[PDB]
Design a protein around this ligand. Structure first.
Ligand SMILES: [Mg+2]
Ligand SMILES: [Mg+2]
Ligand SMILES: [Mg+2]
Ligand SMILES: [Mg+2]
Ligand SMILES: [Mg+2]
Lengths: 123, 209, 55, 119, 114
RNA sequence: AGGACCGAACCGACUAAUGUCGAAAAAUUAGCGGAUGACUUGUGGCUGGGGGUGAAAGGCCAAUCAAACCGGGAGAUAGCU
RNA sequence: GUGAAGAGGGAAACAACCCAGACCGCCAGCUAAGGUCCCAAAGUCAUGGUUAAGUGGGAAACGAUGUGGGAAGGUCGGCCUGCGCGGAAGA
RNA sequence: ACACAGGUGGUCAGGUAGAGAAUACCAAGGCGCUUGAGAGAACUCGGGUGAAGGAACUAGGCAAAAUGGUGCCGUAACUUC
RNA sequence: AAUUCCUUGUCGGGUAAGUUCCGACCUGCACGAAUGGCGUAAUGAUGGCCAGGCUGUCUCCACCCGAGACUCAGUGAAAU
RNA sequence: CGAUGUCGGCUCAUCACAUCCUGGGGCUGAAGUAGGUCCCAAGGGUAUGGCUGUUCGCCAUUUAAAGUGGUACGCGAGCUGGGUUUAGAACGUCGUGAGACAGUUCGGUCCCUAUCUGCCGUGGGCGCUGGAGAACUGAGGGGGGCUGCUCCUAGUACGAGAGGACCGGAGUGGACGCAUCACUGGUGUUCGGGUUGUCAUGCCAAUGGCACUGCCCGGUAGCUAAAUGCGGAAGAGAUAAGUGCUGAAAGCAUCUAAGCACGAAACUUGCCCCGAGAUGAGUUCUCCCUGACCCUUUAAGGGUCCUGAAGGAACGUUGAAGACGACGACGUUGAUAGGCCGGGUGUGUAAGCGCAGCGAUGCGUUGAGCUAACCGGUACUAAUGAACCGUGAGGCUUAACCU
């Protein structure tokens, strides 16, 4: 559950440190974004020698959420913080080349298979 | 086809082998006894009337007793009527088990929803509440404007206002049938059906095929 | 928030028509004391269903 | 929506309601019969029958529970001495509601609530 | 209403160990993809337990590499395969929700003996 | 030592809600400023209406003030209703 | 000229439009404007034509003709005309 | 104007915790506020709690929420020091 | 600019986006030296803007606790 | 002008179509894809933010779009009071001045308990032609009729290349609506525990009162969403724009004047709900009522005694029904409520005793004690009567059917 004006953490090595979801994509009047949802973000904090600079407007995918996911058996997987992996603005591909912390299994798709292969733990 | 009358026992879930928790609704469907079969030659339309459950002689009245005696069955809770299609035939006194749902896949359930009493506009019609601060005075959950100036000069019919909510006949359509059983008189329907625990439900095959 | 014309004695009479009392008919008598009392209520002398229950 | 909720609040907050029921239970155990408003009686039933249920058994812990729930040494003494072994043969239901009439002050339905053994 | 009781009794599993809140547990669960079935382990600290017969569940919290993950499990669900208890916690509270903000070695739990 | 600081009594009244045929013809509640001083208060006295007084707003002068209240001229006058 | 200061009948309703100036009464007759299938009083009257659009019963530039009538030129092309058609969308 | 949630000068003022006449519970002392009984709808008033987000609401962080004590360490630009 | 109509002037900063704000330019409709000009530490229930924590302010409301509303007994207004 | 009291915003809408998207077509400087224009079509949908009081506007980011208008530039006896347009004050300009402004700035009281119409709900009286208990038919009325993306067809037709279809099928989303708590949660001042200060129960221990539930920690049932299921349809009839077949007037041609066939989220059905006050008051099943006297204007008359049934109503216990009514369950031939027993759930190892520790505390009894609204039993308590209402076969003509 990530809405507009929500501060997220970065789970990759693109350079960003804190991002803010400015727009949830996927439809009109859409209000929330679970895991595996493209969101439009802006970069609040960044490291100096990074691939992305502070104040850019890119896309990202939610990979960790305090709200969690719903497995079909009725079991949830909640995380301690809201994390995301940045994406390129038009090619939807991850900018970083590493992934930090665990991710979920909802990312096993043709777009995020690189991320879920790069992640250190898929639970 | 025809439907059946059941009692909502409650809700539970069923675990499948592939790890899916299917929320179901237990509907106790006892054998419905047919009391009167109406046809076009005497009623202008063809249908059957069924009854389910059991009452007591002290609790049944004399007209109901005479009706059940003419039918030739035992007194049940109430009387429900199902429209017949063309071709299907039924006899008075025939007991209808829950074998009718052995081949159906989706059913519609009908029952009186829970009674919410006198509900407000926010509860009933999902109106958006006004401001709780910023000077707002005594208008935190009021409906606001209900019309226009002197040109209409009235309130149109069907205006969404506060009033009685729930406690009415509600039909839920195209519910997947999970498990049918005759020895326990059960009907496990995926999802939620209207009513409280122990309410009378009318389960018919889904019309929206 | 106030009337523009005065209502009549007729409208007053109708509104007062729906506001009327009703006479209690369920007046039982005690099997032993023999005095009138409401159903499911003890008598003036403390009897109820033919049993002195209140001193 | 009061859906399957129990208990009457009787236009009182929780503290006043609990204290009034404590005083009324003490008074009922003391005098074995009182007269009160009919809903007050129907709630005093639920308050004071578990007290006699605790009085049927006998233990230091149960005496302390009854003293916590009544705050009256004389009442707990009577409850464990007279009313305790008296209802040893009853399976609950120790009280009797007898609707008297209507109070002259505010026209409220009054009722005598008494113990079933007071003979 | 014994019907739902009977259905729950016929669906419940009789292979559940007795674990208290605070114990360190490890849940072996089934992860499926197509036809390949793997057995993944999730070993953490039980912070909550809800007992509802068939609908019973338990919340286990494991501090992963960078974050702290919490996962609830339906006790009678076929997605789980086995429950093992490694350590036994000596807490005296039913819901160990303060472990979310403990976030350190002050989140350690003393052992208990028998 | 301080027209010093925080904060009760005391004095005042910055914000919001309630109240608006009010509990109150100016309040209540929650917060608020001063609180040894150009402070506050009790008793008595003086300044009287084109006058008083005013750390000055045309503010206050008995719930009334770009001229108090009462009585009189007076049945002012009204091409207005 | 009417209303103002004039009621009555007509134009559905409509001071100022049309007919007509109320002294009073009558369960009598004749008319004006306007009308005579029913609402709703009186012609489903008579004779000779037109319209096919509900035109009548909201309108123009222009367009095509759909038909009716008349006078002309070598069966056929032009002229004037009556009723029509489209243009014609609002809470 | 009321048997009015307002105003009204001075004296005495105890126990425990507390810096304290604040505050919380008590002593002496005095009260339960002159309409009540049930019901436990909308809505209003005064409060409590709240998943994920945290000003995206709004004219405006209005209102609420938040911080709040004692002792020790440490504490920037600027400055009339 | 508490002063600027044009004007949301132009440039830089802040924000994903800033008619407000901050620093400058002077093209000052229509600043200016005791009707004081320019700075200025401290102070302000003063005006404008930004950041952190915080939250039902909102996303989008949910439940609960008391007082009315509602019903029964008594008393019993008002503007119009 | 003996008052129609506001520019904007919020909540709430409603209509029109000069149509923003979705839908159907015509022409193309329409290879396809994508477009340009025009016609039909109002069923639905038709953003969140930064700036400003702004409507408007500029900018950031999505989808199918972020439509144009009317409704006192809709909406203040519904809310805010930012601007404008009171009284204070200041700047620039103007005038000697009081003061004023093609201006700017800071601050600045928004009343009304709903009589009538209207609307949302819910009742009482009567009617419906003997009375009563049920189940329905359906004249009529109301609600959703939103849609993205991906995949297969298919890298197919088309196309110099690059790109890339129509028709059809399947899967998965956003918004909206309906229902329910099985899951995840929230609340749960009626459940359990911790803890501060204080007062009391004589005291220790143990409890209780107050301090916002004193502050917290969890949390049953109900209620609820963020949670979970379902819906938007398919089909049929008649069509709009449009496409036609046959076809004369007019020996040809012509979609039309005769006749026939297709043709849209539009209309009527189909889906869901209300619904016989549908005074046009409908249909079906069943139950109950089968006495004697008088009189007068020969009345569809009243009265006398006896009967007053089927059923309803009142009263009591009550409910996942509820403002009150109403609705449902039960009333001893009973599980309706309370209690009790057993269980479940929650909190979490009660009190007492013993041991260790001279001394805070720990340890065993012990997953103990306590447990509301939940589940299953149990008449222990409370639901006392044919007591009240409601009756004695139900009007005239005709039409068939037996005298
Ligand atoms: Mg029965
Ligand atoms: Mg500047
Ligand atoms: Mg009254
Ligand atoms: Mg007037
Ligand atoms: Mg203003």
């Amino acid at each position: 559950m990530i809405q507009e004006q929500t501060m997220l953490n970065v789970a990759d090595n693109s350079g960003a440190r804190r991002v803010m979801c400015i727009k949830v994509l996927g439809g009109s009047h859409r209000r929330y974004a679970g895991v595996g949802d493209i969101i439009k973000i802006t970069i609040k904090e960044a490291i100096p020698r990074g691939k992305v600079k502070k104040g850019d407007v890119l896309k990202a995918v939610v990979v960790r959420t305090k709200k969690g996911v719903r497995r079909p058996d009725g079991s949830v997987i909640r995380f301690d913080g809201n994390a995301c992996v940045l994406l390129n603005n038009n090619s939807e591909q991850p900018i970083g080349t590493r992934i930090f912390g665990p991710v979920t299994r909802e990312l096993r798709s043709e777009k995020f298979m690189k991320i879920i292969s790069l992640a250190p733990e898929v639970l | 086809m025809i439907g059946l009358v059941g009692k909502k026992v409650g809700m539970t879930r069923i675990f499948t082998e592939d790890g899916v928790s299917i929320p179901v609704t237990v509907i106790e469907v006892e054998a419905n006894r047919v009391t009167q079969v109406k046809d076009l030659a005497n009623d202008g339309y063809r249908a059957i009337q069924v009854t389910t459950g059991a009452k007591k002689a002290n609790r049944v009245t004399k007209p109901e007793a005479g009706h059940f005696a003419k039918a030739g069955v035992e007194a049940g809770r109430g009387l429900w009527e199902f429209r017949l299609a063309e071709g299907e035939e039924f006899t008075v006194g025939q007991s209808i088990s829950v074998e009718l749902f052995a081949d159906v896949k989706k059913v519609d359930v009908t029952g009186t929803s829970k009674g919410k009493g006198f509900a407000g506009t926010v509860k009933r019609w999902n109106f958006r509440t006004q401001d709780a601060t910023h000077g707002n005075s005594l208008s935190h959950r009021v409906p606001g404007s209900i019309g226009q100036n002197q040109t209409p000069g009235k309130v149109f019919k069907g205006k969404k206002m506060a009033g009685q909510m729930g406690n009415e006949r509600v039909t839920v359509q195209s519910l997947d049938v999970v498990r049918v059983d005759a020895e326990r008189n059960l009907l496990l329907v995926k999802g939620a059906v209207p009513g409280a625990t122990g309410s009378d439900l009318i389960v018919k095959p889904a019309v929206k095929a | 928030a106030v009337q523009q014309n005065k209502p009549t004695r007729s409208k007053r009479g109708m509104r007062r028509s729906h506001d009327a009392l009703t006479a209690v008919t369920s007046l039982s008598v005690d099997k032993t004391s023999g005095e009138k009392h409401l159903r499911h209520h003890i008598t003036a002398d403390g009897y109820y269903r033919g049993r002195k229950v209140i001193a | 929506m009061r859906h399957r909720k129990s208990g009457r609040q009787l236009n009182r907050n929780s503290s006043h309601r609990q204290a009034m029921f404590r005083n009324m239970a003490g008074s009922l155990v003391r005098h074995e019969i009182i007269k009160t408003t009919l809903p007050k009686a129907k709630e005093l039933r639920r308050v004071v029958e578990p007290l006699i249920t605790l009085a049927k058994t006998d233990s230091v812990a149960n005496r302390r529970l009854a003293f916590a729930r009544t705050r009256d040494n004389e009442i707990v003494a009577k409850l464990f001495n007279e009313l305790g072994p008296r209802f040893a043969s009853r399976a609950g239901g120790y009280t009797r509601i007898l609707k008297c009439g209507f109070r002259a002050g505010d026209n409220a339905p009054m009722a005598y609530i008494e113990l079933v053994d007071r003979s | 209403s014994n019907i739902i009781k009977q259905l729950e009794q016929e669906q419940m599993k009789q292979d559940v160990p007795s674990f208290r809140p605070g114990d360190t547990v490890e849940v072996k669960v089934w992860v499926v993809e197509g036809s390949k079935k793997r057995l993944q382990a999730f070993e953490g600290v039980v912070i909550a337990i809800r007992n509802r017969g068939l609908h019973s569940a338990f919340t286990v919290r494991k501090i992963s590499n960078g974050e702290g993950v919490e996962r609830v499990f339906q006790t009678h669900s076929p997605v789980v395969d086995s429950i093992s208890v490694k350590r036994r916690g000596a807490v005296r509270k039913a819901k160990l929700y303060y472990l979310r903000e403990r976030t350190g070695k002050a989140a350690r739990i003393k052992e208990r003996l028998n």
